[PDB]
Amino acid sequence: DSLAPEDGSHSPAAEPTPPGAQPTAPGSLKAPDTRNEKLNSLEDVRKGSENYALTTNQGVRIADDQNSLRAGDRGPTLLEDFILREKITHFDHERIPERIVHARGSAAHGYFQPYKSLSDITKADFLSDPNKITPVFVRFSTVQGGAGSADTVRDIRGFATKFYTEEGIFDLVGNNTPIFFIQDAHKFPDFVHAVKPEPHWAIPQGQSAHDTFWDYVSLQPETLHNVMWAMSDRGIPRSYRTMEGFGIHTFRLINAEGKATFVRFHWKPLAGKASLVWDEAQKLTGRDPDFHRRELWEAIEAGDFPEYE
Amino acid sequence: ISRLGGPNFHEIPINRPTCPYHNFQRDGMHRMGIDTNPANYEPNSINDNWPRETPPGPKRGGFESYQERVEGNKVRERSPSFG
Amino acid sequence: DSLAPEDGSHSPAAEPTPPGAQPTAPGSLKAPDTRNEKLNSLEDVRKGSENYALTTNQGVRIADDQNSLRAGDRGPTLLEDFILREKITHFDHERIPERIVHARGSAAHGYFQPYKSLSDITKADFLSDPNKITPVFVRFSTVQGGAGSADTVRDIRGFATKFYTEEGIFDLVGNNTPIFFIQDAHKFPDFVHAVKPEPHWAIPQGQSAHDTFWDYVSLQPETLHNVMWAMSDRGIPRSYRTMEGFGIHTFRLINAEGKATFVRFHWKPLAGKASLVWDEAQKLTGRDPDFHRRELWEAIEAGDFPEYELGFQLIPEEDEFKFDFDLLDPTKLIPEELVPVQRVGNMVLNRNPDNFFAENEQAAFHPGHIVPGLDFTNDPLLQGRLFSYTDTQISRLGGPNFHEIPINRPTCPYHNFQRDGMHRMGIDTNPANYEPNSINDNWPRETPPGPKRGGFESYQERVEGNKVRERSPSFGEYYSHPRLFWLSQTPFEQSHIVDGFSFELSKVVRPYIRERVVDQLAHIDLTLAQAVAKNLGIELTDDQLNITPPPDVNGLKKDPSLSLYAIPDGDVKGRVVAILLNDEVRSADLLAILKALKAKGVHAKLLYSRMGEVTADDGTVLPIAATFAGAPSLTVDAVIVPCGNIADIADNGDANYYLMEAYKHLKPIALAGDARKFKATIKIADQGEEGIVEADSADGSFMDELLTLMAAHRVWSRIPKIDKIPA
Amino acid sequence: DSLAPEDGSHSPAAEPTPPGAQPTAPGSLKAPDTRNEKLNSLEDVRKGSENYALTTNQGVRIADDQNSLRAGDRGPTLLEDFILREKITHFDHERIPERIVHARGSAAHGYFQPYKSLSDITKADFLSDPNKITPVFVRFSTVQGGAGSADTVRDIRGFATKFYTEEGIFDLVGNNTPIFFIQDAHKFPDFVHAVKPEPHWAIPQGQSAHDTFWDYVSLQPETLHNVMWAMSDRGIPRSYRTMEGFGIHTFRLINAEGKATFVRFHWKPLAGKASLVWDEAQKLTGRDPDFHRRELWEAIEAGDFPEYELGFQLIPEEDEFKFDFDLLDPTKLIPEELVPVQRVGNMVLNRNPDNFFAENEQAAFHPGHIVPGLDFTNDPLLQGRLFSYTDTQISRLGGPNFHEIPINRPTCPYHNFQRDGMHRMGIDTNPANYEPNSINDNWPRETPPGPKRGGFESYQERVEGNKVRERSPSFGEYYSHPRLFWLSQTPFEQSHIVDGFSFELSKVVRPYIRERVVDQLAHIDLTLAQAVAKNLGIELTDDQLNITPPPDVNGLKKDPSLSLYAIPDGDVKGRVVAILLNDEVRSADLLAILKALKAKGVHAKLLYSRMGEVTADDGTVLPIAATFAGAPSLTVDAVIVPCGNIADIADNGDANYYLMEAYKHLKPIALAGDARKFKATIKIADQGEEGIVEADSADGSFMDELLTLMAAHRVWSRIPKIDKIPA
Ligand code: HDD
Ligand code: HDD
Ligand code: HDD
């Protein structure tokens, strides 16, 4: 009953390997020895597969997963085939709405550690002890395109970090430029509608290069600063590893004595800052629309972990 | 699908089997189970075809319908015996 | 308060205009006088905008749509700002789930009209009289990629038509190849999961070129027939206008006397069959991921309406078992040499939607939506489809009232005892919500079946057998149809199939999967298998070289109707030519070029190294449509270079590459006067070659030769020359 | 194929008819001539039924709606039965989430008209012209129970009015008491969770009589004021027609000069104030859980329209701080003795919906739906309400397009740049979906504020303070308003409050909670506290007996407007009388009875020991409406027994109990001729007593005396006599 090759060449080595040397794999199979508190806490919902019987969602073993139940082997399919209907029902409802913005994104697990206690300026527990390790989950993204759009478009990039701290989840939801296009949230649907595919025909995907975007820009000069960044090579990063991150807004740090300090957040890439050039980026959306997602996944599989200060 | 919000209603705790369940179904709203199978289809070679079908048998076998004989034309008709 | 330009140049003309001549627009503003019964019935939900106040959804006029309400102009935003919250709430919930498959699609309104009454073979009302005009809504699609994926991927294409008939909605939900990959609907999630992005990392988008797809194929030889089609140039159509459509399954036509005839449905494109080549298609997903969506919309705005002839392959009930294959097997085609396609009517797509989301995204097609005069068969793929297309709408469209979404509404009457459900629009006045009832005199009432305006009754097919989960043995043949397809292609089409398999298998990381697929190809044709094997560094064994080929299909050595190009059918109307300008164009050349193109309905785009204008030798001001890089040769069907100051562009890398890319992609190229110096960049000798038009000046003969080349689509004889071209 | 009776008795007459005379029907079939702008605007979604074929939702006629498609008439059902699957799918998804609170409610259409222009104090367009008619849709409700819970529970009632104005929808979302239980919206889930069924076992339905509610009350004295109202007979109204309505919060009116006036909204019932008594209300939840829904629908079918006068309490901005309590505290009422209610206009409810689910269940009211001329205040309960009523519709009504559900649609224009979302009905043609735009000349456009037809601008209230989660100290007083309410009630109303607390606390299992509530009552009034304590077997301590009462409210020791009954306001129109028949009724009695009731708009129910008919002494055939047990005295306002063959019913247990129950519940009873023998059943002396009408015959003053009793609602003087009745 074995369909795997006898030489075992179907299974990727569970050790760091360079891009293309092995098939890519789920993280807990590729790197079983990598752990953190969050990864450990997900074990209760991880599901295996090897050596298990194929079942319905109700736990009933399936004998023939190749055929519908019919009245004769050339007959009509019967309504009483609950195995078919459960399998097709689940398939029929697989999709959930994509994010309104930043629908295209690539994510990884990791950890954060502060260099020293910041208790003089903030009572935040995750910043209180250099030995305190906080698990993170990070998602990098474009802004305009759908979940099935291309990576190397000209766009702003999102850089969202979920810190699983001992005193609650802290999400630092930033972008790869230090400002945004607009001043007041009331205008967000206007700006986003202008940059998104135009409503009559739903064109263009992953591009601000169309009338409605530049119409809005020309009528809203507050947008010009972030437009400058988007039109620069900042808009076409070489990799999620080679871009900066910013929280954009001024927030506050609050210490134990009640003192507030204004703060803006920054991520500094250990790999440095690097971008493509336009002709390359555009052609690459055709040759490999998954280039950034792939590069992130493969760097981690190689042990070449993305790092950000 | 409407009452419980989608196709993962078997993951709501009261509905969960206490016996094993494994298959190639994926995703859907409020998906709890995180599948590690490299494959989400069968037949597959990349996971040596697991999880695997099980032939019917006296115990722990796969489900097979009783091979009742069906004979008749396709009709929307009540059986006279019900009348 | 007016932000529009004083000259009115913001507003597109409400008249047919060629691609790029005007901004595109909602269909009811571009073509307000194009009407049909369905389009007219949508007027109750169309919303205008001009001269109206900006309001909340509750009708309250907004005074300041630029600012949130705050405590001081530098203060915190207040929870009482209901205008902000309503606007952001609506934004926050704009997205609905995309279709599980065929998420990427482009749609248009049109109409269908039969050529004659089909009453002798079907009682379907929409086919009963050549005077019956039926509105349609058609959505073309890819299969694998998301709604935001690219158009010109290698994939099967969907071709779904909603017929708004006087006796109900009929949805013909087909594809652009005559078979499907699998035999039984129970396997659909397996096949789709295998072709879709792999579940760990969600790669690759819009591509079958990955391990899991070819793993499934190698283990399920039933897939090989449709795989052959996908690896051919059928997988990369030039336009939705230049592909065929097929219902795939055998259905039944039922006439008034109750006689059943088996039928397979066909759409024949008036524009002919035409496809890209792989390198062009792949690069075009980067240069313009919206290319097919754009070309469909712009053809309709130009008056180049997509047209498709509906055809039926008809097989009497008594002939069910007269072929080498099972009629109910959706992995088998019916060769036109054995059963001709009888043309029965024509469909014209003549208006774009107003709002993509409301009309395209929310449209629900389902092959179970049939009408009296049609019926199903036991095809086990069709049988399971019947369950899926109603089920899936409960999440995708939010509940069981999806038929009340305007695009989905029948134009004929509908009345029943169904009630409630999320977003219920219809307010029922019937005292009864059940039947039988006396309190409403049993209305609405059942209708017996009959020749016209009768109730639906299934054809009383005899069913005999035991309840089994079992594939019919008649379905267990996998190689003869792939071989018939292979043998029916031209030599260059065969080369492109080889290159398709070779490219895709090269992207499979696990080598044994490649080897298993090559072994399957050896069961189809050894020339195909050896050619793919050579490109993969695989050597066939002596055992593989001795595999007996499968038998012919009912005596057929080939069927040229399976080739895109063996029988010429192309027409140039609606195609487009790039014209590469210089700063002092020979106006006489351009006059003759544009006159000849206009006479044939071929569009032109004037390209230069910058935007703005250039002035011809006689003072004619020429407006520039795009730069060489902004509208690459990928987006056109041919390239013409008129004479003038050729020195202006002779050393321009983009201009030289424009011709090299077009040359590599087998497109016609025409060079007038000093533009013939560009022959050096494409390595064409002074004596010239077939496929490169050249003359001292552009003229009638010059343009006749180019338009003849365009009618043949591509210059296949150039293929031996392109491998040395660095492009 | 017609199942209706040949005599047409299945169809109710489309004319006003009294309760029970005809089957009830959808409003547009019962009263097609009753129209308003909103009702007319719904015609595009109303669906008929008569003379139409039964179809699928796709418009396909159904031939056999009695059977599934099967392989043989005794065979398995086939998956290809799309008619079955569509019908069952729709059934399977009929239900939507019920409202979090106020899930049980009953609704009607109507209209509002102001008495005079209020332009001096508000620019609200619907209040600008006495000739301007504003359509309304009103939903009355309970609070705690589910959509399937009973009407006549002890609870607060909701009173929600949707005004379809020319300048937007205004929703006045009020209750039947002038205060709420809590001060800050942050506590709303705590309070509601405490009153709702307890989470382990989901008991009790429709009742605050359980530990968690009284636990919360005992720990949150701010609740005591509205608790007092709920424990009074206010908690058990006779009908939605006989209760007051209140907006509770202080809002603002804004005039064209920008001047703000504080306002509290009031509804005054034309039918007067009237409530049940507890034993009656509780038993009625069993005998007819739909009593209030039924009475509302049947009053409208009878042409006896519920009417309510809108009134305003108006407080100038400079008087904000001149009261002992904070105007922004929703646990405090504004006594009418301090600020009179000024009459504003009248609302008439004159047509029932067609489909309860489509119009009632799907209606969305929200107090943030205001119009120019109105504004909010910093009331911290109102402030949080503004968030909830938009948010909750995303799940309840399936997404952000809930304003497109027909009942919710404005009748005035609504245009904006919002797009998409689930169930999107409107098809936007605007080239732009953003502003500012030039491509549509910036339409739809913002509108500056102005005297009429202007944009919404918030009143520029001064805000000064630090960001704090802190209750205003001015809110920290909890007992003076409960005491004012207590002191304003009649002695019998006070007894009913004592009995309400006593009964509810008896259902609290943990005795310490009862003791803690009694301690709170001792801070309100020691007479109340002692009487409740006595009924609970609790002895007040000396310390409790020495608690100083809270101060008067701005010098008031009572305000009679807080009593249901202190100032008579009852009108008998729309009430109902049970008439207990015998097998040979004295027809002269019955003629005098029925005609006197009819002249005052009082309905009658002819009751007997069986259904069918009886014949009077003169041969008149009398149709029986219900049996004694089938329409118990709980469902009527008074009981009349005419003379005749009294021996027929004298020993009937149900007939005797009918009188005992009505007697216990303080209802007027009238006995003519030999019917006076029933005085022995209710233990009434030969000389008679006030509240029992008796005479030799029903002529003379008999009916006037009974109608006078009915105008006073109940016979409160009878209370000492019922306290030992075995009934
Ligand atoms: C008021 C609306 C609004 C405004 C003004 C912004 N966003 Fe946002 N953003 C959203 C509304 C939103 C959202 C609709 O809530 C999203 C989409 C789906 C989601 O979960 O959140 C989102 C997603 C989203 C993501 C993706 C998170 C993920 O990976 O899942 C990022 C990185 C940002 N945003 C970052 C920003 C930045 C840097 C902004 C400017 C400083 C910004 N957003 C303004
Ligand atoms: C049992 C499952 C199943 C099977 C075996 C098939 N499909 Fe399908 N198809 C669906 C389940 C489905 C679906 C999940 O129900 C979709 C996705 C969203 C939808 O509305 O229907 C769909 C969408 C869909 C569309 C897009 C319609 C649109 O534009 O909205 C087309 C053209 C087809 N299919 C065509 C086919 C063809 C030609 C098939 C083989 C003969 C086929 N499908 C087999
Ligand atoms: C912050 C939460 C919150 C608070 C403090 C209140 N409510 Fe509320 N109310 C809701 C949250 C809510 C809600 C959850 O949003 C409901 C349930 C379903 C709905 O549409 O709105 C609702 C329904 C609802 C209804 C039923 C409307 C209908 O018939 O559909 C009425 C009459 C009221 N409420 C009245 C009030 C009054 C008079 C309050 C105190 C002055 C009050 N509510 C406080």
Side chain identity at residue D627, one-letter code: T
d(CA C603, CA C304): 11
3-class SS at A285?
A: helix
Q: How far is CA C321 from CA C262, C316, C326, C474, D683, in A?
A: 12, 10, 7, 10, 94
C402 close to ligand 2 (CB < 6 Angstrom): no
Q: Do A3 and B61 touch (CB under 8 A)?
A: no
Rg of chain D in Å (alpha carbons):
28
Rounded to the nearest angstrom, the distance between the alpha carbon of D689 and the centre of ligand 2 is 81
Tokens of D419: 């797009």
Radius of gyration of chain B (CA): 19
Of the candidates D238, D239, D229, the residue with the CA atom closest to the CA atom of residue D277: D238
Residues paired with A110 in a beta bridge: A136
Q: For C216-256, what is the HEC assignment? A: HHHHCHHHHHHHHHHHCHHHCECCHHHCCEECCCCEEEECC
- Running DSSP on this structure, what letter comes out for residue C82? H
DSSP C303-348: T---EEEEEEEEEEGGGTT-SSS-TT-TT----TTTSPEEEEEEEE
Question: How is residue D539 annotated by DSSP?
Answer: P
Token duo for residue C251: 């259905």
- Taking an 8 Å cut-off on Cβ atoms, the answer to whether C447 and D54 are in contact is yes
CA distance C533 to C536: 5
How far apart (Å, rounded) are the C-alpha atoms in residues C319 and C262? 9
Residue A142 has a CB neighbour count (10 Å cut-off) of: 24
D492 Cβ contact list (under 8 Å, min separation 6)? D565, D716, D719
CA distances from D37 to B45, C350, C386, D135, D663 (A): 68, 38, 44, 6, 47
Q: How far is CA C378 from CA A66, A150, B67, D169, D490, in A?
A: 17, 41, 19, 55, 80
Q: How far apart are CA D209 and CA D211, in angstroms?
A: 7
Is A158's C-beta closer than 6 angstroms to any atom of ligand 1?
yes
- CB-CB contact of D260 with D177 (8 Å): no
Q: How far is the CA of D101 from the centre of ligand 3 (A)?
A: 7
Q: Which residues contact D465 (CB under 8 A, 6 or more apart)?
A: none
Are D37 and D135 spatial neighbours (Cβ–Cβ below 8 Å)? yes
Among the bound ligands, name the one nearest to the CA of residue D184: 3
Would you call C625 helix, strand, or coil by DSSP?
coil
Name which of D78, D434, D435 to mutate to probe chain A: the one with the most chain A Cβ atoms within 10 A of its Cβ.
D434
* Nearest one of A279, C235, C139 to C147, comparing CA atoms: C139
Alpha-carbon gap, residue B11 to D359, rounded angstroms:
35
Spatial distance between the Cα atoms of C21 and A296, rounded to a whole number of angstroms: 43
Does residue A157's CB lie within 6 angstroms of at least one atom of ligand 1? Answer: no
- CA dist., res. C387 & res. C130, Å (int): 33
CB contact under 8 A, A76 and D81: no
Helix crossing, C587-599 with C700-711: angle to 10°? 40
CB atoms under 10 Å from CB of C56, counted, come to 23
What is the 3-class SS of C149-217, one letter each residue?
A: CCCCCCCCCEEEEEEEECCEEEEEEEECCCCCCCCCHHHHHHHHHHHCCCCCCCCCCCCCCCHHHHHHH
Instruction: Report the alpha-carbon distance of residue C494 to residue C510 in Å, rounded.
Output: 26
Whether A139 lines ligand 1, by a CB cut-off of 6 Å, is yes
Do A185 and C148 lie within an 8 Å CB cutoff? no
Contact predicate C260/C375, CB 8 Å: yes
C-alpha span between D203 and A103 (Å, rounded): 44
Q: How far apart are the C-alpha atoms of B20 and A52, rounded to whole Å?
A: 8
In short, whether C248's Cβ falls inside 6 Å of ligand 2 is: yes
Q: Catalytic: which of D36, D109, D175, D249? A: D175
Q: Is the CB of C385 under 6 A from ligand 2?
A: yes
Please name the residue that has the structure tokens 């909670």: D513
Which residue in the set A29, A59, A69 is minimally distant from B20, CB to CB? A59
What are the angstrom distances between the C-alpha of D617 and each of C582, D438, D582?
115, 87, 10
CA B14/CA D636 separation, integer angstroms:
47
Q: How far apart are CA D347 and CA D269, in angstroms?
A: 10
Distance of CA B81 to the CA centre of its chain: 34
State yes or no: cis peptide before D5, omega within 30 of 0. Answer: no
Q: How many CB atoms lie within 10 A of CB B27?
A: 19
CA atoms within 13 A on the CB side of C76: 9
CA gap C23, A211 in Å, rounded: 9
CA distances from D618 to D583, D615, D621 (A): 12, 8, 9
Q: Return left, alpha or beta for C373; rule: phi > 0 is left, psi -120 to 50 is alpha, else beta.
A: left
Resolution in A: 1.3
What is the Cα gyration radius of chain C?
Answer: 28
Residue C213 — φ and ψ, nearest 5°?
-65, -50
Task: Please state whether the peptide bond connecting residue C444 to the residue before it is cis, i.e. omega within 30 degrees of 0.
Answer: yes
Measured distance CA(C223)–CA(B69) in Å, rounded? 32
CB C254 within 8 A of CB C120: no
Residue with tokens 């399920």: C220
Quote the DSSP letter at residue D671: E
Can you tell me the distance from the alpha carbon of D490 to that of D496, in angstroms, rounded to the nearest whole number?
A: 10
DSSP assigned state of C97: P
Distance CA(C12)–CA(D429), nearest Å, equals 14
- Rounded Cα distance, D426 and D414, in Å: 11
- Tell me the C-alpha distance between C56 and C78, whole Å: 18
Phi first, then psi, for residue A111 (nearest 5°) are: -150, 155
- Burial annotation D101-135 (CB, 10 A radius, 16+ → b, else e): bbbbbbbbbbbbbbeeebbebbbbbbbbeeebebb
Quick one: three-class SS letters along A58-120?
Answer: CCCEECCCCCCEEECCCCCEECCCHHHHHHHHHHHCCCCCCCCCCCCEEEEEEEECCCCCCCC
* Burial class for C54, CB neighbours closer than 10 Å (0-12, 13-18, 19+): buried
Instruction: Check: CB of residue B54 under 8 Å from CB of residue B47.
Output: no
State the catalytic residues of C. Answer: 102, 175
Whole-angstrom Cα distance, residue A237 to residue A280? 11
Cα separation, A9 vs A271, in Å, equals 33
Determine whether C374 is exposed, middle or buried from the number of CB atoms within 10 Å of its CB (0-12, 13-18, 19+): buried
Element (H, E) at D40: helix D37-41
Interface of A with C in 61-80 (CB under 8 A): 63-78
Structural contact between residues D397 and D361, judged by C-beta atoms closer than 8 angstroms: no
3-state secondary structure labels for all residues of D51-76 = CCECECCCCCEECCCCCCEEECCCCC
Triad C513, C517, C520: Cα angle to 5°: 145
Mutate one of D64, D74, D397 to test the B interface: name it (highest B CB count within 10 A): D74
- Are residues D359 and C427 in contact, defined by beta-carbon separation less than 8 angstroms? yes
> Facing residues of D141 across strands?
D105, D158
**Cβ D483 vs Cβ D477: under 8 Å:** no
Are D644 and D671 a contacting pair, CB within 8 Å?
Answer: no
C546 CB burial (10 A radius; 0-12, 13-18, 19+): exposed
Token pair belonging to C399? 């509940």
CB-CB under 8 Å, A46 with B36 = yes
Cβ-based neighbour number of residue C220 at 10 Å = 23
Rounded to whole angstroms, how far apart are CA atoms C333 and C652?
A: 50
Q: Flag if A216 and D434 touch (Cβ within 8 Å).
A: yes
- Which residues, in sequence order, are CB contacts of C703 under 8 Å at separation 6+? C592, C593, C596, C597, C670
Q: Report d(CA A183, CA A186) in Å as an integer.
A: 9
Distance CA A121, CA C500 (A): 61
What chain C residue is nearest to A101 in terms of C-alpha separation?
Answer: C92
CB C662 within 8 Å of CB C718 = no
CB contact set of C108 (below 8 Å; sequence gap of 6+): C137, C138, C296, C297, C300, C306, C349, C350, C351, C352, C353
Q: Is C40 exposed, middle or buried (0-12, 13-18, 19+ CB in 10 A)?
A: exposed
List the one residue out of D274, D294, D91 whose CA is nearest residue D712: D274
Q: How many angstroms separate the CA atoms of D253 and D255, rounded?
A: 7
Q: Which chains have at least 3 CB atom pairs separated by less than 8 Å from chain C?
A: A, B, D
- The H or E element containing residue C639 is strand C638-641
Do residues C632 and C655 lie in contact, with contact meaning Cβ atoms separated by under 8 Å? no
Q: Alpha carbon A251 to chain centroid distance?
A: 24
Q: Dihedral, CA atoms, D60, D61, D64, D70, nearest 10 degrees?
A: -20
Q: Tell me if the bond preceding D436 is cis, omega within 30° of 0.
A: yes
Residue D81 forms contact with A (CB below 8 Å): yes
Spacing of C-alpha D271 from chain mean position: 13
| Backbone phi, psi, residue D71, to 5° | -85, 95
| Rg (alpha carbons) of chain A, rounded to whole number | 24
CA gap A186, A251 in Å, rounded: 20
Interatomic CA distance for residues D585 and C86, integer angstroms? 65
Q: Whose CA is nearest to atom 38 of ligand 3?
A: D174
C266: helix, strand or coil: strand
**Rounded CA gap, C570 and C272, in Å?**
4
Q: Is residue C374 within a helix (H) or strand (E), and if so which, with residue range?
A: strand C374-375
C294 CB within 8 Å of a chain A CB:
yes
Q: Report the structure determination method.
A: X-ray
CA pair distance C530, C539, nearest whole angstrom: 8
The answer for residues whose C-beta is within 8 angstroms of residue C574's C-beta and 6 or more apart is C241, C271, C299, C302, C304, C601, C602, C603
Angstrom distance (rounded) from CA C395 to CA B7:
10
Partners of B73 in beta bridges: C462
C262-273 core/surface letters (b: 16 or more CB in 10 A; e: else): bbbbbbbbbbbb
Distance from CA of D188 to the nearest CA of A (A): 24
Dig out the tokens for D373 from the structure: 């001329």
List Cα–Cα distances, D414 to C57, D304, D374, D429, D441, in angstroms.
6, 35, 19, 14, 18
Tokens 């020339």 found at:
C527
Cα–Cα distance for residue pair B36/D462, rounded to 1 Å:
59
| 3-class SS of residue D474 | helix
CA distance from start to end of chain C: 52
